[PDB]
Ligand binder design. Structure first.
Ligand SMILES: *[C@@H]1O[C@H](CO)[C@@H](O)[C@H](O)[C@H]1NC(C)=O
Ligand SMILES: *[C@@H]1O[C@H](CO)[C@@H](O)[C@H](O)[C@H]1NC(C)=O
Lengths: 54, 58, 161, 108
């Protein structure tokens, strides 16, 4: 899952919907399960910065 | 040596868009510049202290 | 470090039902009105500006820099004279790009003795992708594009040496 | 629709806007050719309209959904209005901030 996948929810990221707390977030080098319905994610990079303090 | 080299620096990176290359390059410049400076300071401090330490003991 | 300047949409064969001839006094060359060399100002032909739709597939291994513009006439009479519609749009898309533009009509200070403006836009088309251009008018079409080859150590400096 | 942030936490609200490949799809789904989506809060305001265009297929799909988000401060209200093309928020996140965390890329 990409960060976009995790937050928007993604049919294949279902295993993440139950995890509410963490110490850090680990993303793989080339995530595939992101925005499954193609489109522009506005201010994506900015959201990643906001979620880095959560 | 231990007391001076106190790290409060955050190196977690940032993503940039295809139209934010100037910002990406500024961020890269800042991280590389700080790294070059601290590498310089760490190596120089150790070499100068090793030389003074040996003179001290002699 | 280098690029190939090549035609994407050759002037003669790409737009058989549009006028591809159009110049301005402000781009005068050797005393004659002229225009940008890598762009084409498309205007109507025989009173019409047929809905335009073009595409290009980047079949090169290189990224392609595509530039185009949008014309914003000084008035309604000019919009009607050139495109023959008051409701024009330009739409440019690629797998990772999407922008829609509309003309704006306004009284403007003259710059280079010209009232009215052309805004310039660009995008980098990745190898294997497709760029699609659609318009009802106001499009300054890409003609030439650059297949870019990147390297290291170069840059732009300002000097009169 | 509206929501009042009655939590002590900031709420991350995400939504999207659909941009069909053609007119026939816009008419089939929303039944209007003039849709808009409008989202406001005391310190946010954005209005969106759909765009119809021929597009390269991505993941075999022509057409796009753009995604948007905002952080709703405690005590504020977010209001969503639309004639069509809205991918509505369902779930949202009440955020709790801390220090020292971050996102890293790793395959360890
Ligand atoms: C080129 O620059 C000269 C500078 O004096 C100017 O007079 C001329 O109009 C410019 N021509 C074009 C096509 O930009
Ligand atoms: C008319 O213009 C369109 C522009 O996209 C072109 O595809 C078509 O071949 C042109 N046709 C004529 C003169 O039949």
């Amino acid at each position: 899952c990409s960060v976009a996948g995790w937050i928007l929810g993604n049919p294949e990221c279902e295993l993440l919907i139950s995890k509410e707390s963490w110490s850090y977030i680990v993303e793989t080098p080339n995530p595939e399960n992101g925005t499954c319905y193609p489109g522009y994610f506005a201010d994506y990079e900015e959201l990643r910065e906001q979620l880095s303090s959560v | 040596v231990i007391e001076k080299m106190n790290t409060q620096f955050t190196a977690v990176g940032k993503e940039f868009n295809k139209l934010e290359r100037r910002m990406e390059n500024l961020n890269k410049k800042v991280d590389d510049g700080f790294l070059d400076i601290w590498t310089y300071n760490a190596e120089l401090l150790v070499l100068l202290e090793n030389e003074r330490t040996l003179d001290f003991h002699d | 470090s280098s690029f190939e300047r090549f035609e994407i949409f050759p002037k003669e064969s790409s737009w058989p039902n549009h006028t591809v001839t159009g110049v301005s006094a402000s781009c005068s060359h050797n005393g004659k009105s002229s225009f940008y060399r890598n762009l084409l100002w498309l205007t109507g032909k025989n009173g019409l500006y047929p809905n335009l739709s073009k595409s290009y597939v980047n079949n090169k291994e290189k990224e392609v820099l595509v530039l185009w513009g949008v014309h914003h006439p000084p008035n309604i009479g000019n919009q009607r004279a050139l495109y023959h519609t008051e409701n024009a749009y330009v739409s440019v898309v690629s797998s990772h790009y999407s922008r829609r533009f509309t003309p704006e009509i306004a009284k403007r200070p003259k710059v280079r003795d010209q009232e009215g403006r052309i805004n310039y836009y660009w995008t980098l088309l990745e190898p294997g992708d497709t760029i699609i251009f659609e318009a009802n008018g106001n499009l300054i079409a890409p003609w030439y594009a650059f297949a870019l080859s990147r390297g290291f150590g170069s840059g732009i400096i300002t000097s009169n040496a």
